[PDB]
């Protein structure tokens, strides 16, 4: 029952075999296994349904911590533990090949580095080249998103959405590819990234 | 909106205490770069009064009026003498002395504004004009009548307009709405009767001039 | 100066109203909201009943589906 | 909004955000935020009792946003009765960033919703629901034996409808029970189950569901499920709409759309 | 209710504080805009006393006082100098001073109001008219007997009631009733015996006067 | 209970000052109707002492006499002077000063107790009564013997019980139980040596007068 | 109390309420919050301290409610040593509302249980839970296997009683290991499981489950489930208890109550 | 930005104090651990004024002045007694007191800075030289025209860049940047008129000196 | 740490616990608490700023201890680059509690391991959990159709491995993507999975997995998961490892260890 | 000494407690 | 203290065609049911 609101899913990415929805709930819900598989994070701006994929690079802003001085601690570093990597993450999705019936696809995690293991259903039929890719993506997109960081944004800049990507210079560093998660627009804006 | 005309007497206004506030700031980071952002409503007075009540049954009087106000009913005239002349003090308030602004040949309706500043006056558009003070004079010569001053207003209207590229001078006292900030009304009166007295000044009462919302 | 209320019941109250109306995985750190996908139509059924509402499918997936207005039976000949 | 990231950063801004507001019954507000009334295109914002409480919730709707913006409670610009009544419940209102200093510079901080409101005895609260919370609510398509034909004339009922409803004006006032006349002891039974839109008075068309019709003398006593919303006074048009039972059955007798029955009885 | 009637000692009185007391303000939003919230029936004053004991004995007789009340026991006479006289001070008060009403032919009761404010006075019912200070007064004539004076309702029944035309007009000394805002008394008396002091200044007794519910 | 008995030295307690606290209020609406609640203990009265105390020896008895209490087991005498009197401290006090009571027939014991005001006196019973200066007077004649007075209980036994009609009237000085407020003792000495000295006033000690709960 | 409302409207109340409380001893305790002790309705309140906390809960059994009342500890109202032992524990207290100013009118404002007990070295804090909240236990009624004689002596379970209850002195205190005499050694081993009320001391009847009674050269000695409440004198008086096992052999060979065994030894 | 430039009277800046904000402290543990954190480009300096306007026109003056801002729009021109001398308060300033730089072939364009300390010295450049008290001078001889010297940048650019070798030496007077700590403004003005009073000193007007960011 | 009681116990007590810190890399930092350097067991622990303890969490491993301690960063002593590489990450730092008074006695107040770690400008925050914690994480033990040899060359592995491994250094720095040489194209495609551990640079045998192994002009360009932790110089030594696929058919193909396959696939 | 008892297992002892032992549908509203 | 409600386990165990399910490499004398693993196919001797 959505009212015909502009979506635009151009940034949105992605191919199903097949999908079953039971009970039509919310749209964000229904969507919301395809937001892992595909890789897409869904956000509305202006009453337009803005789904940008997740790393599909939509735009990357650039700022600088020197120019940001609206707060002294504009350096936090929201780092994660990075204590919970699991080395296999073994997805039960069904297989359009293998006779539309689900199937386990174990994601290797890179190297050494893991924290226990985790293991995700799919709902999505997919293909077995889609199966053990998607959820490989998962594991090394993840890593890199344990290491964060914490900023403020002045009244002036408005570019920043949340849910957008960021290139923010850290001074000491060069810029790291961020992605705004969540920013309290309005006179300070306090951006995760 | 009419309001309820209450004047506040310049007698127990005299001896008061004021203060000016500005709604204007919101900086923004410590680079050095200050971003200025106004939401209106700046510069309002507050003045802490009930000064020179002299003895009690003056006070009595002045109480009286705050009753009247029954939790100031609208709003409540207060005297400022600060603004009542448009030039300095001692020196005689004039038509010339405040210029309303220029005619453009339909400009009926010009506004009492006291223009504070140079450069970027701040102007305090005057909601009630003291009656008799009101002076109006067009760049030709001082008009005697047809421009139609309304008092609750504060715009005097001409009849006929301006024609394009006249002065109009116009200076007059300045009466000013007043709120009380607080509903409770502090009282000195250092008791009578034998010990008889009435205390010269009553506790400061809290009463701001308010730019009334439109 | 009475007994709980504020000790206990009111202390459930204040606690629980900011966490009940407030702001709207492991490896993930973020915890961004994403709904695992179920087993869906793996192994599939014949529920008799067809109150429950359909599968609606909106891509290729098998279904056994929900039986409706199966025609009684037809019984020519039992033993 | 452009412009208005320029006046930031300029420093000369002067904020004029006006939260237009437009209520279910599509009454607008504009509620500036600027202490001095702003007509921008054409509309004027009211400086008097405009909430404020401009950041509130600011997400990009990952996370629904209920912008809470309590505010004062004006009279004129707002109604309790009418916040009673739910005109204002389900308002959406868009909050459009301007500026003073540039009227022409309109950016749309955030498209908002009203949903959940709350009352003072001066003052009010209010939570700026986003759409998506509104779209995320589960209506869950169930498909099930009795006609899910439900309100009828819907697309998927292609109800001709037509001929059996009926026009009435009340007769006599007695809240949920209300006895009306100018309906038929034929039409009285036909219109249980339904509903009683008022084109007389404040309704306008708004009708409480009637849980029973039943004739009576001086015309149909109707029974609605409940009280009208707002007194409706004796001599208030209403037009009476036929209710089904939406079984198989009544969807049946009462108008037989086969091709469009929703009722999957057997199993 | 009925209340209690015990009398505060002029004296005590004579040191004792007053400040008025209003409500009915809840203003909202600041950006100019103001709503008059009216909680009713206002106007209260408030009192500290003690600061007229003189000596211990006294002081000893109005904490006595407070004792008997056991914390404010229904009402307490206190009696007010600044409402004691409808006129003034050095003005004695007089029936015709403060306006009752005017009799309509079927207005057999009046409570002595007092009217303060002028354009929109509010006034005063006064829950016990002082005796002997009560004075009926008829447009025609002042008026003697024949009205009955509920002391503790502070109404004034005229038997026949006055016709239409007639002004009544009573003035009275005013036995406003006061309810003691806290328990606790702070004593100051000095020590006697040897030392042979004794304190003319208790310090915080605070009363409120009580508008009681009738 | 028994307690502890240890005399306040009234020289001590020369100079000190004291507060009155009641327990009664717990008011209802603003409507001006106000409902007292009490839960008793009304009335304490808190003393702050130490003053008075002298030289550093004089001022050592009494911290002898905190740490013989340590940390006030029981309750501690504390004499009054203001109770001290039944009569105005310059007047005697007598049996006739306060009346008791009047006897049934039956009425052979009688609690000493002050009545405080007239119309609802609040009566304060008196725990201890100073030897010696308790006379009791029957209605017939002031009584030598017979009325048995048990110290710590405040009450007189007549022997005989007072017939129907009798009145009872005695007079006592006043010794009031006390509990300090604070372990901690506050101690002004001045330092003696070359440059002698002694306190003649330690800082106030907080001693409550209690009323105490059984 | 209905005249205390009344006195509320004069407002001329004094609060002479008594906390009045049963334990399972049934001892009764006033504790009336009135400073001057009240004796209401036939029943003695002294003044002991009042349990007073924070503010009341109140709602009418929809929702349990636990009174945290606060009361200090006072040694004549209640001592630890009980408490430890628990006949404090279990206490009902009904709080009835008396009016100072009046004796006569005495209504219960509330009946609550004692819950849960907090102590503190020289004050205690508990929590005068609602009877719902007891009763919201679950038993469960849950039905498998052992027979249901299980207690000798329950109603249903329609014992014999009789013969094998034995009656015993304490030769020696061990606290749970303490040896009895009066006891046969064919009474050991069939008092197995069994119970032994002390009817001597405190207990008063009150017995810890034997978890095993082996006969020993001096009397049986036996051992507890758990050390007795209280020190246990020896010699104390004592009711030596028959345990059953419940299982269906045992139940059948101690005393085959076919007609009352809930046994499902075969399914 | 452009900002604004707007004189703030000599006079009552003689009024106003004067105090030294500095930053770039944030030291690590308090073991003796120091670690110096560095906010950057501080030194700022803090002022009260208004207690320079000595009269009722003046401080009316300073008050359309900040009306004139509307709440420091851009920057405000202040004078500082402190920074305008480079030499002494006694001693007058020359292009040679301070030292703007050398030139390198290359250089034509120097802002004037002052330098603080000597070792380390920490070097403001100064964005609004007081007019007239500029003068350029060269190693070889103080230098006239060809020096194009931007007020509002403070920077003097030399047409024909100076060779390396002849040392840039300018002495100015400092019109340094303001902006207003508070929006809020205190008035004591003291009622004129029939009192005739007028106030030397208004308390409660804090600025900032401003390192405006370009 | 019982001398160490016994200095409480007579109150000569000066408190030197040195928080000797070893990261993944090995790296020990003292950290020691008292101000003045304690050479305890030789190794030197300096106040360094040592991460500040004030709360005592203690349970003895039923609950992991996570002290937070975060203390103002030291730059000598940590640094953030290592921290966002994560060598920080993972250290293992065993709280001893040492005395200034006496250096011989040391007892480890516990054994913990920086887990989840946070910055700031100038400090860093960070969560020590104890041993438990990373032990209580699930493996599960997973058994399923893939090879779940996983890692080639592990013990139960029992890999061959040998002659298909190679060594490489890289032609050009791309980041995940950078080309490298000395690989033949057989090799790539045989490392398609596998990892590129760095000999050379900070890595030193630390690789990002290859996500890809195309063959290019002037060697294999590879491409890495994910971008190399540190900037990865061009002709850094890198050993370039066969990455199994573990499908029955991959793992057939490279090895064909049917001894240790660990994959259970056809059914 | 050690650190975060307070920060975090204090954290939810203090608002678990008032929970714990506090007072006992979407369309229904009140619940 | 921490506990893990008691599962139903071993009880009710039936074989399972799906292979995602772990092994449940049992440490102590269980009775399991387990899963099928590599069934040879069938032999259809007679279909009808």
Redesign the interface.
Same mark, same amino acid.
């Given at each position: 029952g959505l009212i015909s609101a502009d979506i635009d899913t151009s940034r949105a990415y992605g191919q199903a075999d097949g999908y079953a929805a039971p009970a039509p709930l919310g749209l964000g819900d229904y969507a919301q296994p395809f937001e892992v598989a595909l890789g897409l994070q869904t956000t509305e701006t202006g009453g337009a349904l803005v789904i940008e994929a997740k790393p599909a690079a939509p735009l990357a802003a650039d700022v600088i911590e020197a120019d940001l001085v609206d707060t002294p601690a504009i350096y936090t570093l929201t780092r994660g533990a990075l204590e919970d990597t699991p080395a296999a993450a073994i997805v039960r999705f069904r297989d359009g090949l293998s006779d539309y019936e689900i199937t386990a696809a174990r994601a290797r995690i890179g190297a050494g580095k893991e924290g226990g293991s985790a293991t995700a259903d799919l709902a999505l039929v997919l293909d077995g080249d889609r199966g053990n890719a998607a959820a490989e993506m998962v594991l090394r997109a993840a890593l890199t998103s344990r290491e964060s960081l914490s900023v403020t944004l002045p009244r002036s800049a408005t570019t920043l959405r949340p849910g957008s990507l960021v290139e923010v210079t850290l001074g000491t560093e060069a810029r790291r590819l961020f992605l705004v998660d969540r920013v309290v627009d309005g006179q300070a804006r306090e951006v995760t990234l | 909106m009419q309001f309820i005309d209450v004047e506040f007497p310049r007698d127990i206004a005299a001896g008061c205490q004021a203060v000016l506030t500005r709604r204007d700031e919101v900086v923004t980071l410590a680079s050095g770069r200050e971003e200025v952002n106004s939401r209106w409503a700046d510069t309002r007075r507050s003045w802490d009064a009930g000064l020179g009540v002299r003895d009690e049954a003056d006070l009595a009087q002045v109480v009286a009026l705050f009753e009247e106000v029954r939790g100031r009913l609208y709003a409540f005239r207060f005297r400022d003498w600060l603004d009542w002349r448009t030039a300095a003090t001692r020196a005689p308030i004039t038509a010339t002395d405040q210029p309303l602004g220029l005619g453009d040949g339909s400009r009926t309706a010009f506004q009492v504004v006291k223009v504070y500043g140079a450069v970027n006056p701040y102007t305090r558009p005057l909601s009630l004009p003291h009656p008799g003070t009101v002076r109006v004079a067009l760049d030709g010569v001082t008009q005697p009548s047809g421009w139609t001053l309304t008092a609750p207003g504060g715009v005097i209207t001409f009849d006929t307009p301006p024609a394009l590229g006249v002065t109009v001078t116009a200076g007059c006292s300045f009466d000013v709405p007043v709120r009380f900030s607080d509903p409770e009304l502090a009282v000195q009166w250092a008791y009578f009767r034998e010990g008889q007295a009435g205390l010269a000044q009553a506790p400061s009462i809290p009463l701001i001039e308010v730019r009334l919302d439109p | 100066?009475?007994?709980?209320?504020?000790?206990?019941?009111?202390?459930?109250?204040?606690?629980?109203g900011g966490a009940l109306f407030g $702001?709207?995985?492991?490896?993930?750190?973020?915890g961004? $909201?994403?709904?695992?996908?179920?087993?869906?139509?793996?192994l599939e059924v014949m529920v008799?009943?067809?109150?429950?509402?359909?599968?609606? $499918?909106?891509?290729?997936?098998?279904?056994a589906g929900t039986? $409706?207005?199966?025609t009684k039976l037809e019984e020519i000949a039992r033993t | 909004m452009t412009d208005y990231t320029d006046h930031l950063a300029t420093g000369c801004t002067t904020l004029a955000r006006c939260y237009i507001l437009t209520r279910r019954d599509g009454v607008v507000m504009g509620f500036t935020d600027h202490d001095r009334d702003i007509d921008l295109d054409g509309t004027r914002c009211a400086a008097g009792a405009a909430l404020d409480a401009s950041t509130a919730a600011r997400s990009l709707g990952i996370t629904p946003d209920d912008m809470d913006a309590g505010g004062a409670l004006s009279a004129d610009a707002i109604t309790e009765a009418d916040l009673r009544a739910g005109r204002y419940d389900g308002a959406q209102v868009e909050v459009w960033e301007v500026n003073w200093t540039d009227p022409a510079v309109r950016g749309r901080l955030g498209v908002y919703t009203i949903g959940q409101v709350e009352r003072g005895p001066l003052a009010f609260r209010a939570e700026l629901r986003t759409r998506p919370a509104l779209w995320n609510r589960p209506e869950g398509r169930i498909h099930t034996a009795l006609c899910d034909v439900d309100r009828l004339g819907d697309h998927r009922c292609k109800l001709a409808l037509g001929p059996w409803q009926s026009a009435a004006t009340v007769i006599e006032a007695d809240g949920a029970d209300l006895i009306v006349s100018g309906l038929d002891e034929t039409a009285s039974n036909i219109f249980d189950r339904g509903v009683l839109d008022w084109t007389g008075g404040a309704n306008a068309g708004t009708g409480s569901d009637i849980r029973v019709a039943r004739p009576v003398a001086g015309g149909v006593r109707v029974s609605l499920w409940s009280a009208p919303p707002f007194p409706i006074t004796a001599g208030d048009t209403a037009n009476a709409t036929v209710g089904c039972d939406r079984t198989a059955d009544t969807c049946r007798n009462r108008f037989d759309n086969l091709a469009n029955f929703r009722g999957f009885p057997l199993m």
């Open positions: - | - | 100066a009475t007994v709980l209320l504020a000790a206990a019941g009111g202390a459930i109250g204040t606690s629980l $702001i709207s995985a492991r490896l993930s750190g973020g961004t $909201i994403k709904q695992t996908g179920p087993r869906l139509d793996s008799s009943q067809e109150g429950t509402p359909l599968a609606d $499918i909106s891509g290729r997936v098998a279904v039986v $409706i207005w199966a | -």
